[PDB]
Design a protein around this ligand. Structure first.
Ligand SMILES: Nc1ncnc2c1ncn2[C@@H]1O[C@H](COP(=O)(O)OP(=O)(O)O)[C@@H](O)[C@H]1O
Ligand SMILES: Nc1ncnc2c1ncn2[C@@H]1O[C@H](COP(=O)(O)OP(=O)(O)O)[C@@H](O)[C@H]1O
Ligand SMILES: [Cl-]
Ligand SMILES: [Cl-]
Ligand SMILES: [Cl-]
Ligand SMILES: [Mg+2]
Ligand SMILES: [Mg+2]
Length: 540
């Protein structure tokens, strides 16, 4: 693998939940420890499972991995780090400022943004500890900071400005400005840091990764490698329509990578029949050469949704899980059964009217607004700090939700279906200053969580649900999209993967959701009403 060659001391893997960052990191560590290198594997995930893969426990203390001489591990808990970040700022004012005030300040430090800043504080400590490179040849991280977090920390305004906002976290920066600048130099130095962009052969993901590449390079991280994971080996595309349609779909994408990633050294890793749970399994991942559950169809959820003839239906979930596709499929079925439906989308690509809002224009409107509102009196460094804060992922969600709010009032006379929604955290924040009760009322609004029959994706969906719950919003149901167990295939590899889904689909059924739907992988893309209708399955 090109990414495995002459690696600098710091190795970072970035990419969406479940693309394979941790798996690839563990396999990389083993491989390097076996070449005689001293390796430190830094587990960064919220519910770390790294200990599991090595069949041993690991904590916030460096420990050698008994089963792999040369390798040690360290777990940095992000939820714990944000918690302490929050406590450092809030504890001094408890019993001082009135309870509602403290509670408001506390909520401002409970979003994904505070968690990212806290994670960076953790990354910074490791990146600045020169002693580490005295004991280790390489330190591998299974996540990486975002361009947004890095830009925030490099802005002069962050160290001299006082102003829905996510800058509250800044107040908690543990270290001196010099250490963060140092950490940033370490990240931008190709002789010290290598960044691996992990992706899947799917047109959508590739575009997101392309964007990530441009943001990080723009900041100075130009030592980047592209690793395409889970690729279907051609062999499997023999004697099977799905495996062939899939193999065909990835191939097109593989041969038509987005221009921005074309010049990057690219390696591909084949799809494995079993979720790697040991060293042999892990190491097999770097190789250069190669029955159903009892869950209702989407039709079923839609059937129960139709019951009251109207209402607000909101599809939520992480990026790329299928919110827009599911929302489309829901609106089509409702419309097809005589109900009045109004579908709203943020993605540019009768008795059913569709509204498309342009995220960019809404964001910019909303941005212009918060700028004249909170920007006055701020010097220029302060305005740039504020502008960068308006570059958080939540800024867009707020702006788009803002726009969808125009037609959310129609949920009273018909069905309004939205393909995206803000977080519970953001909702709470917006409600501090918006139709909160509407969203909280179980009748009027039905929140659907879209996810995948995979480990990380399920955990991420569960965390999004816990957060909505804090905001008094209970998800009405869960939709497990792209399932193989529900799809028909004779491909042994595929059926093997379908089997790997069972545990995840089970944890959703008996722990996360009351109402659950299973949607099959359709191969290609459900772009036409036909395909869209095919996802639902039949009545009764
Ligand atoms: N090429 C692959 N083939 C088959 N399974 C894979 C591959 N890469 C990862 N996985 C499996 O997928 C899950 C995806 O996870 P992980 O590597 O935890 O990614 P992330 O850290 O990006 O969430 C695990 O259950 C895992 O063992
Ligand atoms: N069941 C499915 N079968 C095949 N492709 C799917 C399925 N669900 C989603 N996709 C495809 O996946 C992408 C994932 O997207 P999208 O539904 O736009 O989700 P989101 O709105 O959550 O980002 C699009 O390329 C899409 O058409
Ligand atoms: Cl946030
Ligand atoms: Cl936050
Ligand atoms: Cl932030
Ligand atoms: Mg991980
Ligand atoms: Mg979408």
């Amino acid at each position: 693998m090109q990414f495995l060659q002459n690696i600098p001391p710091y190795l970072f893997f970035t990419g969406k939940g479940g693309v394979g960052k941790t798996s690839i990191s563990c396999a990389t560590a083993i491989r390097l420890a076996e070449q005689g290198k001293r390796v430190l594997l830094v587990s960064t995930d919220p519910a770390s499972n790294v200990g599991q893969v090595f069949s041993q426990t690991i904590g916030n203390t460096i420990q050698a991995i008994a089963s792999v001489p040369g390798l040690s591990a360290l777990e940095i808990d992000p939820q714990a780090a944000a918690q302490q970040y929050r406590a450092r700022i809030v504890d001094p004012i408890k019993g001082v400022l009135p309870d509602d005030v403290v509670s408001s300040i506390n909520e401002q430090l409970s979003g994904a943004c505070t968690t990212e800043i806290a994670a960076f504080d953790e990354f910074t400590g490791l990146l600045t500890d020169a002693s580490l490179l005295t004991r280790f040849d390489h330190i591998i991280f299974d996540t990486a900071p975002t361009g947004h977090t890095i830009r925030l920390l490099q802005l002069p305004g962050a160290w001299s400005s006082f102003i829905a906002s996510c800058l509250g976290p800044m107040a908690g920066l543990e270290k001196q400005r010099e250490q963060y600048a140092y950490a940033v130099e370490a990240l931008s130095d190709p002789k010290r840091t290598r960044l691996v962009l992990v992706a899947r052969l799917q047109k959508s993901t590739l575009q997101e990764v392309a964007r990530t590449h441009l943001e990080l390079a723009a900041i100075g991280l130009k030592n980047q490698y592209l690793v395409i994971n889970g690729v279907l080996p051609k062999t499997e595309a023999a004697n099977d329509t799905l495996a062939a349609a899939i193999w065909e779909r990835e191939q097109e994408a593989l041969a038509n990578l987005p221009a921005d990633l074309a010049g990057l050294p690219t390696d591909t890793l084949f799809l494995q029949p079993v979720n790697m749970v040991g060293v042999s399994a892990l190491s097999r991942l770097l190789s250069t050469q190669p029955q159903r559950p009892d869950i209702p169809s989407l039709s079923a959820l839609v059937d129960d949704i139709a019951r009251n003839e109207h209402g607000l239906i909101m599809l939520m979930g992480k990026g790329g899980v299928g919110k827009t596709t599911m929302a489309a499929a829901i609106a089509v079925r409702l419309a097809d059964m005589g109900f009045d439906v109004h579908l709203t989308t943020s993605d540019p690509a009768n008795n059913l009217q569709v509204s498309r809002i342009d995220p960019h224009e809404e964001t910019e409107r909303y941005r212009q607004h918060v700028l004249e509102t909170k920007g006055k009196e701020l010097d220029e460094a302060g305005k740039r700090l504020l502008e960068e804060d308006l570059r958080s992922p939540c800024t867009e969600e707020i702006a788009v939700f803002q726009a969808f709010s125009r037609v959310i009032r129609e949920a009273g006379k018909r069905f309004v279906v939205m393909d995206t929604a803000p977080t519970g955290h953001t909702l709470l924040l917006l409600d501090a200053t918006t139709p909160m009760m509407l969203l909280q009322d179980p009748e009027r609004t039905k929140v659907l969580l879209v996810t995948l029959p995979e480990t990380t994706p399920v955990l991420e969906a569960a965390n999004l649900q816990a957060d909505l719950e804090r905001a008094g919003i209970h998800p009405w149901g869960w939709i497990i999209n792209n399932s193989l167990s529900i799809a028909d295939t004779r491909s042994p590899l595929l059926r093997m993967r379908a089997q790997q889904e069972l545990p995840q689909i089970e944890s959703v059924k008996r722990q996360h959701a009351s109402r659950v739907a299973l949607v099959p992988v359709l191969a290609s893309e459900p772009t036409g009403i036909d395909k869209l209708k095919q996802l639902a399955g039949h009545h009764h």
